[PDB]
């Protein structure tokens, strides 16, 4: 009575039938439909609403059964057909302001996933990505994304990881028949690597196949790679990192200088081409990862280091930071005979920065600050960074970068002195201490009188000052009499009497403790 | 020694290749080593004639001219003082004018760099030569059309440098009339369109030109050139997607232009405002990390100009925004801003429903749908994310705290938006006051309350004095810092305003889940208190609650928790009876 097209097209009776079939006691009503899957084939083709009605009923049946999956091959032969159909995509994308049948994609993807999770259909599982990251996304993302992220890398490839990867690689032929670019071919790299990493902590032929099948600029056609390149580079990085180690990598990577990964990454990141920062810096990271474990070539590590240092201009922070974290401990360990050489190259690239390129200098300062442990043996290079911090702290650092970077760079030399004494340029260290004194009582004014951040960093700078005097570097610290006078004498002018003077008072108390240790300062308290 | 060492090395052409590089190394050492006052000015007075004689000769080249320009760039990097800056100004502005807008080397780039580093001293009497430079700027800007029109299908970095140099040189000095001439140049700006990389370089030249035209965000100027800015906006959509930094700077320059009232009113009538968050303001296929800035700019624009958009424009704007409201990759801040935009636009849609036969009910219901969907998604995932890291019986945690705060604000914004939307659909489409809702929106509201009674549970997490999150107790009878009280009060207000006999069905269906969540979250008890305090809705809710509790009475003897819950519910019922006897 409900399946009559005349009544099934009516919203009232269709909603009534849906509510009835959704009820708990609808077991016999669902059985008569499961016994006739061919009925939906006549509806899954102006009478286009029958498609949505059939997709809705199928979703209810699947949700209430959870086992009527292996008996619906002829149905999914049409259900997946409309899923991958360009007509469906266009019809549902072009006009979606107030169009009915809005939840069709969610239920369609849900039933497709329910079917594909019982039988491992590769083509269907990979075509499911049409709405996993790309396409149209209105509640359709998470239900499948969480599945592919947690359930898939749990029990999917427990027995046939290599065969599954080979199937996903052979997918290129059926894929190219309907999808030729990253929109699907790039997303397929995620479902595989979640497991490759979950079990990366077994498949030798796949490592040999991936390199030769995806030759540099696959198919000798670079024009088609826009985002697939970045994900292939990430694949190669995490591959040389965890799953295949030297044992499996060196077998085929012996031809690195040939079309293998080395040439797949080096020419693009070296030349000025590939203006897209993402792909360039991901190739840099791939080279860094390769160098970290193997491929001790003819000093190309220094070339990569230089290309990375000079390239991190505006927004390369994350990728270049990761590449340095992966490579910074690799170059010195594998350049024992060239420690002085690499340090002098660093000095050179530092002194060739006469333009001072503020953002480049900040990035380099942050780089050398992250790795405090790798420049204790180069105290000769502290003068440049100290002179740079001196000028950094003088600029109007309304922004967050300059003065915070300066104070943490001062903490860097504090820790350097700590590890040096308990295993230095005296005048520059005295100037550094005087700067920490000045900047500590200057940042207090950068922020408003009250009700705003900026005081916790001033307190941590005061703590840095307190700690820097415990080493034997305190005797030669200079009293900033004029700065203290000017800042605290502001109280004579009732304007701008903010708590900045209170931090100045705490610093005067710290220096009072110092003179308590060495009464010589009594003669310096005249101002 | 530096003096007699650099002087004895004087060599013009006898050793062109490496002697100049050795002298460059020597002067770099000189610059890295401190110099005293007696060894400060004479060095520059000797360098200036040397720079002159070295630039006199040797005007894709890789000849000693390159190392000569490098020595010049180093002499520039010196920046010792200003007293000896006068003849260097003449030399720089003489070498600047020649061989521009051609396949020339970077000599002009460092030239503009030294020009920028030169005008910082505020030299009055050199305004004539920089005025000639501005005349050359007038020339090149008017020549740009012919340049792009002579190179067809059958370097390019000079214009951005010149533009930023003119910007920084017009910002510092006294305000003069020369900026009006530069404005007249903005009227003559180029708007038409490896060699393709050079054409993209010309596009970014135009982008830097526009970045200089940002002056539209300054003292008012006669703007009779809407066609030129429209062509430039078209070129922006024609700009490349691979360059992320330049696209970001372009979006910043655009949002800055849109930050004034006299420019917003001209945007909506341009191409029907169809060039919104469709893939024009962001990378086409390269990168979409700067998406937050573009979305914020578009939201501010549509908010300032919402009062002049027809049905189709607002409909497709909502269609484009609801797509990003659900994007999990975006920070929750953008989601809160989009919810604010939607709840502020709901009132405008309602007010405009009087025109064009309305058609607002459909869009308002369709966006209430996405609002309830966001409610459900956050109550399903955000609550789990926080509960999977709670420390019972008490850095990435610092950011997780900010995320928890963003979610706590998101739930409030969602409640407010849902209230404003409920006010909307019940006041448009003839219209009849307090029309009985249809079954569709009735079930939608049932699911809305069912899912929002869970989202409100985000207020049970607290921040400690050490940084670790803490889960609140089941019942403490406190004020909850007043943060959530108003939130659930507005949540109740959402339903207090709807039709009575629809409230009846909704709460007859959802009263068991209500008491269940109240037993699991005592903070929701005030929702029932607000329902019982509001007139025209207290009787129905009280009747439903008593009819539900009279059958669950024997359950009070099993455990003490639900017994106390039912006791408090009966106390509230008696209070309501006393208030609405």
From Swiss-Prot, chain B:
Chain segments annotated as transmembrane: none
Subcellular location: Nucleus
Listed result of changing residue 150 to C: In DFNA75; uncertain significance
Self-association state and partner proteins as the record states: Interacts with MYC, E2F1 and E2F4 transcription factors. Interacts directly with p53/TP53. Interacts with GCN5L2. Component of various HAT complexes. Component of the PCAF complex, at least composed of TADA2L/ADA2, SUPT3H, TADA3L/ADA3, TAF5L/PAF65-beta, TAF6L/PAF65-alpha, TAF10/TAFII30, TAF12/TAFII20, TAF9/TAFII31 and TRRAP. Component of the TFTC-HAT complex, at least composed of TAF5L, TAF6L, TADA3L, SUPT3H/SPT3, TAF2/TAFII150, TAF4/TAFII135, TAF5/TAFII100, GCN5L2/GCN5, TAF10 and TRRAP.
UniProt comment concerning the protein's domains: The PI3K/PI4K domain is required for the recruitment of HAT complexes, and the MYC-dependent transactivation. Although it is strongly related to the PI3/PI4-kinase family, it lacks the typical motifs that constitute the catalytic site of PI3/PI4-kinase proteins, and lacks such activity.
Disease: Developmental delay with or without dysmorphic facies and autism: An autosomal dominant neurodevelopmental disorder apparent from infancy or early childhood. Some patients present with intellectual disability and renal, cardiac, genitourinary systems, as well as structural brain abnormalities. In some cases, the phenotype is less severe, has no systemic involvement and is characterized by autism spectrum disorder and/or intellectual disability, sometimes associated with epilepsy. Affected individuals manifest variable dysmorphic features.
Family indicated by similarity: Belongs to the PI3/PI4-kinase family. TRA1 subfamily.
Known function: Adapter protein, which is found in various multiprotein chromatin complexes with histone acetyltransferase activity (HAT), which gives a specific tag for epigenetic transcription activation. Component of the NuA4 histone acetyltransferase complex which is responsible for acetylation of nucleosomal histones H4 and H2A. Plays a central role in MYC transcription activation, and also participates in cell transformation by MYC. Required for p53/TP53-, E2F1- and E2F4-mediated transcription activation.
Protein name as catalogued: Transformation/transcription domain-associated protein
Native source species: Homo sapiens (Human)
Source species taxonomy: Eukaryota, Metazoa, Chordata, Craniata, Vertebrata
Included range, full protein: 19 to 725 of 3859
């Amino acid at each position: 009575l409900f399946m009559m097209e005349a009544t099934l097209n009516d919203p009232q009776w269709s909603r009534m039938f849906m509510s009835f079939l959704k009820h708990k006691d609808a077991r016999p009503l669902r059985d008569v439909l499961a016994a006739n899957p061919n009925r939906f084939i006549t509806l899954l083709l102006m009478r286009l609403d029958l498609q949505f009605q059939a997709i809705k009923i199928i979703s209810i049946i699947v949700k209430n059964d959870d086992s009527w999956l292996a008996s619906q091959h002829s149905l999914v032969s049409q259900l997946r057909r409309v899923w991958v159909s360009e007509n469906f995509q266009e019809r549902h994308r072009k006009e979606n302001m107030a169009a009915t049948n809005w939840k069709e994609p969610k239920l369609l993807a849900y039933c497709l996933l329910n079917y594909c999770k019982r039988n491992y259909g590769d083509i269907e599982l990979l075509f499911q990505l049409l709405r996993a990251f790309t396409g149209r996304f209105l509640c359709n993302m998470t239900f499948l994304k969480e599945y592919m992220e947690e359930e898939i890398p749990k029990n999917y490839s427990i027995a046939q990881k290599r065969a599954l990867f080979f199937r996903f690689v052979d997918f290129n032929d059926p894929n190219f028949g309907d999808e030729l670019k990253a929109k699907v071919l790039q997303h397929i790299l995620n479902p595989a690597f979640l497991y490759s990493f979950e079990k990366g902590e077994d498949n030798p032929e796949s490592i040999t196949s991936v390199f030769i099948t995806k030759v540099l600029d696959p198919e000798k056609q670079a024009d088609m790679l826009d985002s697939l390149r970045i994900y292939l580079l990430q694949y190669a990085t995490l591959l040389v990192e965890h799953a295949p180690h030297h044992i499996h990598d060196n077998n085929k990577n012996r031809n690195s200088k040939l079309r293998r990964l080395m040439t797949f990454a080096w020419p693009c990141l070296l030349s000025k081409a590939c203006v897209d920062p993402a792909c360039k810096y991901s190739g840099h990271l791939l080279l860094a990862h390769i160098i970290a474990k193997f491929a001790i070539h003819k000093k190309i590590v220094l070339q990569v280091f230089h290309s990375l240092l000079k390239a991190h201009a505006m927004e390369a922070r994350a990728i270049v930071r990761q590449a340095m974290a992966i490579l910074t401990p690799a170059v010195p360990a594998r350049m024992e005979d060239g420690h002085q050489m690499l340090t002098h190259w660093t000095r050179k690239i530092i002194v060739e920065e006469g333009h001072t390129v503020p953002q480049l200098v900040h990035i380099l300062h942050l780089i050398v600050q992250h790795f405090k442990v790798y420049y204790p043996v180069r105290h000769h290079l502290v003068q440049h960074m100290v002179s740079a911090m001196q000028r950094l702290g003088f600029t109007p650092s309304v922004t967050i970068e300059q003065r915070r970077l300066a104070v943490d760079l001062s903490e860097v030399v504090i820790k350097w002195e700590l590890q040096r004494i308990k295993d230095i340029d005296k005048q520059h260290t005295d100037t550094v201490v005087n700067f920490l004194i000045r900047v500590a009582c200057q940042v207090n004014d950068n922020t408003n009188t009250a009700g705003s951040p900026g005081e916790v960093l001033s307190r941590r700078c005061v703590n840095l000052l307190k700690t820097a005097l415990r080493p034997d570097m305190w005797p030669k610290s200079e009293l900033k009499l004029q700065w203290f006078d000017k800042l605290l004498m502001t109280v004579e002018q009732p304007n701008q009497v903010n708590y900045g003077n209170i931090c100045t008072g705490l610093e005067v108390l710290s220096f009072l403790l110092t003179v308590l240790q060495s009464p010589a300062i009594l003669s310096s308290f005249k101002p | 020694k530096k003096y007699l060492q650099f002087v004895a090395a004087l060599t013009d052409v006898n050793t062109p290749d490496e002697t100049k590089l050795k002298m460059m190394q020597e002067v770099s050492e000189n610059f890295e080593n401190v110099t005293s006052s007696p060894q400060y000015s004479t060095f520059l007075e000797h360098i200036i004639p040397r720079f002159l004689t070295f630039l006199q000769d040797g005007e894709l080249q890789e000849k000693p001219a390159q190392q000569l320009r490098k020595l010049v760039l180093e002499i520039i990097h010196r920046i010792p003082t200003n007293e000896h800056l006068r003849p260097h100004t003449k030399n720089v502005l003489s070498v600047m004018f020649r061989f521009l807008e051609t396949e020339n080397e970077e000599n002009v780039l460092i030239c503009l760099r030294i020009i920028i580093e030169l005008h910082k001293q505020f030299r009055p009497p050199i305004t004539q030569e920089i005025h000639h430079f501005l005349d050359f700027v007038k020339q090149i800007y008017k020549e740009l059309p012919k340049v792009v029109n002579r190179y067809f299908e059958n370097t390019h970095s000079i214009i951005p440098r010149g533009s930023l140099s003119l910007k920084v040189l017009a910002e510092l000095p006294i305000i003069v009339v020369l900026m009006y001439q530069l404005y007249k140049l903005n009227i003559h700006n180029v708007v038409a369109e490896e060699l393709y990389a050079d054409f993209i370089a010309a596009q970014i030249k135009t982008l830097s030109f526009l970045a200089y035209i940002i002056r539209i965000y300054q003292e008012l100027v006669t703007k009779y050139s809407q066609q030129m800015v429209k062509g430039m906006l078209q070129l922006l959509s024609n700009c490349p997607a691979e360059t992320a930094h330049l696209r970001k700077e372009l979006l910043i320059a655009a949002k800055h232009i849109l930050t004034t009232e006299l420019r917003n009113q001209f945007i909506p009538c341009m191409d029907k405002l169809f060039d919104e968050s469709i893939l024009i303001g962001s990378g086409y296929t390269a990168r979409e990390t700067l998406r937050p800035l573009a979305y914020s700019t578009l939201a501010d624009l549509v908010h300032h100009v919402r009062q002049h958009l027809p049905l189709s424009d607002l409909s497709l704007a909502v269609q484009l925004f609801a797509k990003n409201i659900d994007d999990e990759s975006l920070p929750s801040s953008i989601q809160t801003m989009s919810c604010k935009l939607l709840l502020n636009l709901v009132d405008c849609i309602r007010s405009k429903s009087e025109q064009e036969s309305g058609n607002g009910r459909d869009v308002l219901m369709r966006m209430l749908e996405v609002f309830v969907l966001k409610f459900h998604t956050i109550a399903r995932y955000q609550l789990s994310a926080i509960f999977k890291k709670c420390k019972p019986q008490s850095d990435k945690e610092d950011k997780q705290t900010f995320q928890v705060t963003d979610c706590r604000s998101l739930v409030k914004t969602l409640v407010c938006g849902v209230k404003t939307i409920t006010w909307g659909i019940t006041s448009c489409k003839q219209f009849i006051p307090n029309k009985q809702l249809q079954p569709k929106e009735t079930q939608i509201y049932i699911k809305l309350v069912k899912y929002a009674m869970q989202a409100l549970d985000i207020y049970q997490v607290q921040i400690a004095g050490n940084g670790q999150t803490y889960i609140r107790v089941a019942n403490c009878q406190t004020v909850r810092m007043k943060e959530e009280k108003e939130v659930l009060e507005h949540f109740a207000g959402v339903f207090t305003m709807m039709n009575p006999l629809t409230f009846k069905e909704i709460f007859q269906t959802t009263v068991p889940y209500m008491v269940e969540r109240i037993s699991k979250n005592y903070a929701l008890q005030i929702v029932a208190n607000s329902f019982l305090a509001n007139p025209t809705t207290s009787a129905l809710f009280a009747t439903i609650l008593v009819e539900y509790l009279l059958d669950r009475l024997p359950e009070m003897g099993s455990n003490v928790e639900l017994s106390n819950l039912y006791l408090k519910l009966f106390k509230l019922v008696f209070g309501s009876v006393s208030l609405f006897a």
